[model samples]
Target: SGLVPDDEFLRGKRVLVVDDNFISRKVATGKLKKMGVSEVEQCDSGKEALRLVTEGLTQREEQGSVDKLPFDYIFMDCQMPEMDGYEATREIRKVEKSYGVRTPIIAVSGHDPGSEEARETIQAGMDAFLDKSLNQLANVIREIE
Candidate 1:
């Protein structure tokens, strides 16, 4: 691999945006695109996200190339009704160990990052926490990268 510029760091990366709200997911999709993330997938539920995460592995196996990872990062909404991001993250982490994968799952929420929910995010095995916004997303990416 060659060294890339700041923009290129995120441009080629694949992402998944998970949220229960259609409008919120729509907004996140737009933001990721604006940031130059071309391979963005939207999911309305955590369970469905898990499906994509797992299914992607089989799809990769069929492809016969080295593109085995489905998503480089995930933006997970913390407040979904059925399976919230915390529980979703826990489940995802459980699934990851079997395949030697640890997709960065960012906890997104309207609440401040200092809140108790944010703490719970880390406890649940999420990689990062952010108050949903373009700047926050970029900052977290840069920090992690």
Candidate 2:
């Protein structure tokens, strides 16, 4: 294609980004896309994310033929309008088994890491944790890469 290696390593891999802040979603989507993610789905509310992730986004397709589009990773915000990230994550885990998908949810927060909020996120089915205000995008990408 365009001087890139076989992008099968990247294409069709979907990530769910749950943040009530529009600016944060835009910034995080840009960063994640540059990291080779082909699909970055967004939810402005934790409630919506829980519904979509748990229900698997299908309009009642035939049994055994349903194309369950599962997200590979999740980036969740700690605060939102209706449901906070912690409660939403707990809800998602309750439905993970019924949907047959095991997605890695990473908690993202702007709150001070020392606060009990961070610890609560870890206890809420998060595979990893990240500080949201860090501006060193390249450095973070390098470390992850």
Candidate 3:
């Protein structure tokens, strides 16, 4: 079982789900909402997702609290049209390195766990990567919290 509605750890956590696939995004968003993540933001493109993360970092800096980031966690899709997850993750990593901040980024993809894609995922700055399934996504969040 997962966290209940009133769970302390996940109740107010801000999360971002980024995927070009409409159905995948919807399912991930729904799962996060059900897990008591009150603030869930969904974006379809990696470009937009990077924009949000950049803006979020600025906001957190202005607030003067590392823990008060706009989005506490990010679920990133590996393959997209314009900018892939690797590209976005690299951009986010650059921003974070420049700002001295770290945000947990989980890469979601259909790629095999032991494939070269997995190595590339970690190399791109994501904390972890998983097969594209709701259970794995939920499990990653659960483990993180």
Cα lDDT, all candidates = 0.80, 0.69, 0.79
Off by over 4 Å in 3: 1-9, 65-68
Candidate with best TM-score: 1
Note the residue pairs that clash in candidate 1: none
- The TM-scores, one per candidate, come to 0.86, 0.73, 0.85
| CA lDDT for candidate 3 | 0.79
Q: Which is the winner by lDDT between candidate 1 and candidate 2?
A: 1
Candidate 2 residue spans exceeding 4 A from truth: 1-12, 57-69, 133-145
Ranked candidates (TM-score, high to low): 1, 3, 2
Name the TM-score of candidate 2: 0.73
Candidate 1 residue lDDT tens string, 1-145: 1111134547888999999999999999888887788699999998998889888866775786486679999999989988988889888888777777678788888866555775677678887777766456777876767
